[model samples]
Target: LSDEDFKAVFGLTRSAFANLPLWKQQNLKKEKGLF
Candidate 1:
């Protein structure tokens, strides 16, 4: 992912991030360490 994409994930509130779909959360984490 791009730097902005990573930053966008970091900008999310804890609860907002927590509310992401399970697959997406894992996908991001595995793909770009977003989690």
Candidate 2:
């Protein structure tokens, strides 16, 4: 998804990001180089 689309789908708080569905949580973190 585009930035806007991603934001729209995951308009979650920073803290809430940690609680997202496991698949998505891992993807985002890996993409972010956080893992």
Candidate 3:
């Protein structure tokens, strides 16, 4: 998904992505690097 799409779904700001759990973050990162 696009940056806008990600934020819309997760309700997370771009910077907040890093604050997510490591596994979740890593999974998203691997799938699309959008987290």
Candidate 4:
């Protein structure tokens, strides 16, 4: 978190945050997870 550039690359947006779980769920059909 201290590293601004690192945080920039790996941050969640509001809409994307909400959608991530859905995407993860859908992805589970193919594999079993998301990191």
Candidate 5:
């Protein structure tokens, strides 16, 4: 996937949102900050 491709990984429980991968990957890679 390209850098902007936003993939999702669910959290601990079923009633949880996803972890925005592309944003986070780029965010983390670019700057050591939270998403």
Candidate 6:
């Protein structure tokens, strides 16, 4: 993905992920097929 796309989809910082718990993040990632 482009940098802008990545930021738009995943945010610009680790804190964005940290804001949600791992399970929630994993759920979202899984739903999006990001992993």
Using TM-score, give the best candidate's number.
Answer: 6
User: Model 4: which residue pairs collide?
Assistant: none
Tens digit of per-residue lDDT, candidate 3, span 1-35: 56586777666655687688889777876776453
Candidate 5 TM-score to native: 0.29
Report the candidate with higher lDDT, 5 versus 6.
6
Off by over 4 Å in 3: 1-14, 33-35
lDDT at 16 for candidate 6?
67
**Residue 19 displacement (Å), model 1:** 0.6
**Candidate 5 regions with alpha-carbon error over 4 angstroms:** 1-20, 32-35
Worst 10 residues of 4 by lDDT: 1-10
Give the per-residue lDDT of model 2 (tens digit) for 1-35: 45455555556555577668888878876776553
Expressed as tens digits, the lDDT of each residue in 1-35 for candidate 5 is 22333222222222222344566555554563324
Q: All candidates' TM-scores?
A: 0.46, 0.46, 0.44, 0.28, 0.29, 0.51
The order by descending TM-score is 6, 1, 2, 3, 5, 4
| Whole-model lDDT per candidate | 0.63, 0.64, 0.68, 0.45, 0.36, 0.68
- Evaluated against the true structure, the overall lDDT of model 3 is 0.68
| Model 2 bad stretches (over 4 Å) | 1-14
Q: Tens digits of per-residue lDDT for model 1 on 1-35?
A: 45555557655555655588988767767776545
TM-score of candidate 6 versus the correct structure, residues matched by position: 0.51
Clashes of each: 0, 0, 0, 0, 0, 0
**Model 6 spans with C-alpha error above 4 angstroms:** 1-3, 10-14
lDDT by residue (1-35, candidate 4, tens digit) is 23453234335443454566775645543452233
Worst 10 contiguous positions by lDDT, candidate 2:
1-10
